Amino acid sequence: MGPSLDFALSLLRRNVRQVQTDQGHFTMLGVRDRLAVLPRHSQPGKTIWIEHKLVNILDAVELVDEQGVNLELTLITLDTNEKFRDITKFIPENISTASDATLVINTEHMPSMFVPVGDVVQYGFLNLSGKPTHRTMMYNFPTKAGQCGGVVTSVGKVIGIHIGGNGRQGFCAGLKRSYFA
């Protein structure tokens, strides 16, 4: 087995979780410790289904940019026994683009799904379903629903959380390492 398959499979193994909320199925990225991240619109409550059990959520923090605008990411802190593997190092310090990116989706309905989204490029601003959102990025792939949360990865870097699509294009909320400190 080669480099990027091993990395993307290691994430599937250790960090990417199948979850469910009143809104439906999403892919959760567990980043370190008891800290996970989901799309904002996933609308996590006081509890969240994580694969085989309902997990208590202690804290939920919806992220806004300096101008108080939506980033589309919620940092959830979980009442879970054991720490997530630390992958903060894999996350760039500032939002980065990539070439030949891979969308990693893990969901009850689409488990361990690998989607070749291609080059990822700055989009900057997206409006989805009425909410104005910053620090987004774009890939030219027809991304379907139930693929939100999916993890954008290139070459051992973890660069976005999927949040949107128009049927010809996908957009993710880019990841910054400061978010998870």
Ligand X SMILES: *[C@H](O)[C@H](C[C@@H]1CCNC1=O)NC(=O)[C@H](Cc1ccccc1)NC(=O)OCC(C)C
Nearest distance, CB of residue 47 and ligand X, angstroms: 20
Nearest distance, CB of residue 131 and ligand X, angstroms: 4
In our burial notation (b when 16+ CB lie closer than 10 A, e otherwise), range 109-146 reads ebeebebebbebeebeebebeeeebbbbbbbebebeeb
For residue 109, indicate whether it is catalytic: no
- For ligand X, the closer of residues 7 and 76 by Cβ is 76
For residue 66, indicate whether it is catalytic: no
Nearest distance, CB of residue 3 and ligand X, angstroms: 28
Residues that bind ligand X (CB under 6 A): 41, 72, 128-129, 131, 133, 143-148, 163-166, 170
Specify the residue for token string 């973890």: 158
Rounded Cα distance, 51 and 72, in Å:
23
Rounded Cα distance, 176 and 179, in Å:
6
Nearest distance, CB of residue 163 and ligand X, angstroms: 5
Q: Is the dihedral of CA 5, 155, 115, 61 positive or negative?
A: positive
Residues 6+ apart with CB under 8 A from 131: 40, 41, 70, 72
Candidates 32, 38, 37, 44; CA nearest to 82 is: 32
Query: Active site residue: 72, 134, 162, 172, which one?
Result: 72
**CB of 57 within 8 A of CB of 25?**
no
- For ligand X, the closer of residues 97 and 169 by Cβ is 169
- For ligand X, the closer of residues 7 and 126 by Cβ is 126
- For ligand X, the closer of residues 90 and 95 by Cβ is 95
For residue 52, indicate whether it is catalytic: no
Q: Which residues participate in catalysis according to the annotation? A: 41, 72, 148
